[PDB]
Amino acid sequence: NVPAELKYSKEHEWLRKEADGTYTVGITEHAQELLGDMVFVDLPEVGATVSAGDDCAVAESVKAASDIYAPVSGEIVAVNDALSDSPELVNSEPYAGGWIFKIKASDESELESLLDATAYEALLEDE
């Protein structure tokens, strides 16, 4: 399950441009499958300024945990508070209700450092 329109990181995040011009970030179907049943998501602080590649959230399952990185630089403008209660949304709806945070990008040329869907599919086959 690799939505054809998203951009992806090598750390298994996806990035979606929204109608308000901000970007939504979550983890992929593959990511949630690797982690298994979700227990806790540590969300970033709204208002925080991050550089592309900064660690800004953590996903923890019954068995494992991974850092989650800003795919682009910018300002965190929203976080999915639903995950505090229902982190399992990351398992059931990784591209939808399980989104993690939203960023107002400071340099959109950074999109060029992300993978397109076909590259992410290739990455999965090499893992």
Ligand SMILES: [Ca+2]
């Ligand atoms: Ca936090």
Ligand SMILES: [Cl-]
């Ligand atoms: Cl989904």
